[PDB]
């Protein structure tokens, strides 16, 4: 056995100890972190709460992030123009350019797409000279119904401005570049010594098996609905009762075996407009026995007694109820002492005393 | 508008043509053929190496063609590359999001690619001169999650996704070339032939489709399952197709016979299938269960040649090395155990 590769082995042991240090710091910072899941029915409620908690950032604060969106804007530029030419090639009409040399420029730019370097003036000249044909805009009209990012022409005229070096563009290019929906958006913020991580759902599926089983490890669940949904139209048929499938969601989560010992937090976003329609319209649609009493104040109480007693004979967990508040500062208090209390419960059950 | 029903009657006529043809190929008894061979006997395997270091579950595992390096993906947000001969780490890779449902490794050994719920598959270069691991590309364009994705060649890769479609990708242009449609249910798994010309796609519609790469046309449909399909594995010559299912049953199909051959189950086996893998010989069948027990099946004689156990939590991943000397397993127990 050679000494030098043996020293490479022990060197792999100490570099493996460095890897173990990364696993230690990552595992401790994961293990101290407070995780909470976000669900909801209405888009306006979830968007109202998450934009309500949103603290304003600057898009261009860092030059490293500036390099990031240089790569992303270059990606949308080159990806856009190659999508335009292959979109033309997918047409059954014979649509070629008048100038034949521009086709050599187009094959050269299909070669030029692969390099990892920076953008040169010649490729920008190719895409601008090809872009000056109005039939490419006619192909934007045809390809409007196909797979394409709809802001694309702005990227090319913008790149006509971007051709000069040492540019810095403003915020709306960055924010417009992150105008997309799919994927789960993670948020990280701090309130009173606790670090929160929220995981929403893009609403990508009606059916939940695999990704719903992978959300097993979680401290608490936030479920938001609009109680006003009995007067709200969510229907493709005569039956417009959103609360039926909403209670199907709540019962579906509560009756799932994976989430047997985890609590639920529950919010009601809209109340004022709700009160005015209480005067305008009686809640007779759901149940008559629900609408035993005319008076507006206790009309909420039935909703929390229904959603509260939809639990299936389990008393290790309890559904916390809350109401809409003018200021976000009151909202995070309920989350704060709620998760503090359930952590205290978990530690008490861990110590064996309770 | 009633013509769709008319062609549904003609379609049903082609279906009774299918049952008559499959009866004509169902004249013969397989039990005689399986009866004409000698049994193998009891097999005992022992765990020679175990692996550590993960603080979370194991959702992916994939082999290299050199039969040295193993890659394992956890959901705490890290990839680590293993050496199986000496139990040494090679590289440790952090990624943007902790959601990882699949992994892969290059046949050439140069690339590694992962992905998950964030709709973005990332391919990583390992032989870069700077001494780290860099994000080369981020491929996007799907609307759902991607369940499994694997390299056929170094220039073009295949993914399966949650929008019920499949897609062929090109790395250098970062744009999809060919897309495959025709499923009504979610695509759950993927496997490709060793000849690399044909890959089959399982789904949750209790069906399986045989897809071609160059021509883009589904040629044969295999149906007759009662539940979802989780794992797929190919026979080494490419002439036999095996399927896993949810109800603790497994079936084998043939492309040239166009009929199911043998269904594997037992009265005491009620837990579903999580992974399926063959051996080089094709005589043996490995399968993972939900009740912590991996039964080793005889493919021809349909009897259990042995039972292996020793994990505490549910097994997720199963595979064999290319040279045939070892079987690796992974579980939710956060430890890996290899059988020899």
């Amino acid at each position: 056995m050679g000494c030098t590769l043996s020293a490479e082995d022990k060197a792999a042991v100490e570099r493996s100890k460095m890897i173990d240090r990364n696993l230690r710091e990552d595992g401790e910072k994961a293990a101290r972190e407070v995780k909470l899941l976000l669900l909801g029915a209405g888009e306006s409620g979830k968007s109202t709460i998450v934009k309500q908690m949103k603290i304003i950032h600057e898009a261009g604060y860092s030059e490293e992030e500036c390099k990031q969106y240089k790569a992303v804007v270059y990606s949308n530029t080159i990806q856009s123009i190659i999508a335009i030419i292959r979109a033309m090639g997918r047409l059954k009409i014979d649509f070629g350019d008048s100038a034949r040399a521009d086709d050599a420029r187009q094959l050269f730019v299909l070669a030029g797409a692969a390099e990892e370097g920076f953008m040169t003036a010649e490729l920008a000249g190719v895409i601008k000279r090809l872009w000056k044909d109005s039939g490419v805009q006619a192909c934007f009209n045809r390809s409007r119904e196909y797979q394409l990012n709809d802001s694309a022409a702005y990227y090319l005229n913008d790149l006509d401005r971007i051709a000069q070096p040492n540019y810095i563009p403003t915020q709306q290019d960055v924010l417009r570049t992150r105008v997309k929906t799919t994927g789960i958006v993670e948020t990280h913020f701090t309130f009173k010594d606790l670090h929160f991580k929220m995981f929403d759902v893009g609403a990508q599926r009606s059916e939940r098996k695999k990704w719903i089983h992978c959300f097993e490890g979680v401290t608490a669940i936030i479920f938001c609905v609009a109680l006003s949904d009995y007067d709200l139209v969510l229907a493709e048929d005569e039956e417009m009762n959103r609360m039926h499938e909403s209670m199907k969601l709540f019962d579906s989560i509560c009756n799932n075996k994976w989430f047997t010992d985890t609590s639920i937090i529950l919010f009601l976003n809209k109340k004022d407009l709700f009160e005015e329609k209480i005067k305008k319209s009686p809640l007779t649609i759901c149940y008559p026995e629900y609408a035993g009493s005319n008076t507006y104040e206790e009309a909420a109480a039935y909703i929390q007694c229904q959603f509260e007693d939809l639990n299936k004979r389990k008393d290790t967990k309890e559904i916390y109820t809350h109401f809409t508040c003018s200021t976000d500062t009151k909202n995070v208090q309920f989350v704060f002492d709620a998760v503090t209390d359930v952590i205290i419960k978990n530690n008490l059950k861990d110590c064996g005393l309770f | 508008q009633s013509e769709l029903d008319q062609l549904r009657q003609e379609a049903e006529q082609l279906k009774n043509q299918i049952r008559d043809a499959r009866k004509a190929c169902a004249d013969a008894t397989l039990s005689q053929i399986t009866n004409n061979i000698d049994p193998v006997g009891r097999i005992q395997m022992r765990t020679r190496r175990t692996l550590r270091g993960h603080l979370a579950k194991i959702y992916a595992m994939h082999w290299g063609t050199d039969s040295r390096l193993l890659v394992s993906a956890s959901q705490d947000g890290k990839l680590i590359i293993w050496d199986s001969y000496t139990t040494n780490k090679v590289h440790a890779i952090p990624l943007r999001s902790s959601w990882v449902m699949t992994c892969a490794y290059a046949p050439s050994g140069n690339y590694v690619a992962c992905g998950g719920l964030d709709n973005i598959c990332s391919i990583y270069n390992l032989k870069t001169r700077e001494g780290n691991v860099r994000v080369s590309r981020e491929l996007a364009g799907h609307t759902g999650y991607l369940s499994c994705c694997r390299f056929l060649d170094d220039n073009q890769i295949v993914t399966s996704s949650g929008d019920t479609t499949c897609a062929l990708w090109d790395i250098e242009t970062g744009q999809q070339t060919t897309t495959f449609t025709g499923h009504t249910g979610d695509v759950m798994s993927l496997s490709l032939a060793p000849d690399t010309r044909l890959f089959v796609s399982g789904a949750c519609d209790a069906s399986a489709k045989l897809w071609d790469v160059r021509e883009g046309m589904c040629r044969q449909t295999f149906t007759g399952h009662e539940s979802d399909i989780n794992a797929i594995c190919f026979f080494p010559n490419g002439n036999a197709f095996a399927t896993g299912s949810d109800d603790a049953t497994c079936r084998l199909f043939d492309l040239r016979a166009d009929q199911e051959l043998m269904t594997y189950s037992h009265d005491n086996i009620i837990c579903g299938i999580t992974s399926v893998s063959f051996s080089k010989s094709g005589r043996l069948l490995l399968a993972g269960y939900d009740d912590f027990n991996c039964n080793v099946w005889d493919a021809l004689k349909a009897d259990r040649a042995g039972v292996l156990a020793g994990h505490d939590n549910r097994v997720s991943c199963l595979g064999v090395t290319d040279d045939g000397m070892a079987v690796a397993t992974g579980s939710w127990d956060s430890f890996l155990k290899i059988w020899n």
Partner: antibody, heavy 127, light 105 residues
Framework: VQLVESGGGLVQPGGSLRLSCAAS????????IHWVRQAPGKGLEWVAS????????SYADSVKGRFTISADTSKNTAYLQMNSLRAEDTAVYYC?????????????????????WGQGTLVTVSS | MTQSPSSLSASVGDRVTITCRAS??????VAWYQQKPGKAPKLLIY???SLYSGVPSRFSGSRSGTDFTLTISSLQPEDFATYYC?????????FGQGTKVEIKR
């Protein structure tokens, strides 16, 4: 498909002959035809090419200013006219086919290589 | 611009590595041809990685920067000929100087 050369022969200095390669069964409008020089004892040099879809063509630097080329896409026959031959121009000429654009025919994977090769023939310059 | 290949000889079943290094930055437009005397050039690999249809699993390849490496494992007795490195990234087309493979006696 088959690529068949024609028009070759053994040549004297000061003469001129017309080189030709026949296209068989493939679309000639969508491809390019390439001619290379195989020197005796040495490797391969590339000299001339015919591009059908754009019309412009490229020549080797040592040879440009002497040769001219034309082609007829309707008869599936491409021609090369060689003039001002010198004694060093003895070489074997291969007919070769490279596809520049692969998408306008049908949707196919990107390619970079010579698909089909002719059998070649000897042309010499000797007094 | 030009490129500088290399040449080596080996025995039966020996791995051989052929390296074709470029002068400037070139995209993945590279092909390898086999030329034995009495035969036309045969295309083996296109775009420097992907194999042609009909070629067995013995051949491989890679791309790193402008360095390209050809790998032939499990060598056959019939495979002895020149191998050419090809560039196709600009309208100008450059061919290589070529290698050779001989059997060790």
């Amino acid at each position: 498909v088959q690529l068949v050369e024609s028009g070759g022969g053994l040549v004297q200095p000061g003469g001129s002959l017309r080189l030709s390669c026949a296209a068989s069964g493939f679309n000639f409008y969508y491809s390019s035809i390439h001619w290379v020089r195989q020197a005796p004892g040495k490797g391969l040099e590339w000299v001339a090419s015919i591009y059908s879809y754009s019309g412009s063509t490229s020549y080797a630097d040592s040879v440009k200013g002497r040769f001219t080329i034309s082609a007829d896409t309707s008869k599936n026959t491409a021609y090369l006219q060689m003039n001002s031959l010198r004694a060093e121009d003895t070489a074997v000429y291969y007919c070769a086919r490279y596809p520049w654009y692969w998408w306008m025919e049908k949707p196919y994977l990107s390619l970079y290589g010579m698909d089909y090769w002719g059998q070649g023939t000897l042309v010499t310059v000797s007094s | 611009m030009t490129q500088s290949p290399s040449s080596l000889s080996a025995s039966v079943g020996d791995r051989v590595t052929i390296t074709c290094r470029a002068s400037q930055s070139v995209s993945s437009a590279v092909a390898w041809y086999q030329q034995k005397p009495g035969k036309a050039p045969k295309l083996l690999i296109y775009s420097a990685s992907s194999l042609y249809s009909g070629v067995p699993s013995r051949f491989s390849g890679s791309r790193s920067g402008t360095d390209f490496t050809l790998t032939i494992s499990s060598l056959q007795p019939e495979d002895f000929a020149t191998y050419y490195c090809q560039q196709s990234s600009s309208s100008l087309i450059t061919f290589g100087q070529g290698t050779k493979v001989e059997i060790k006696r």
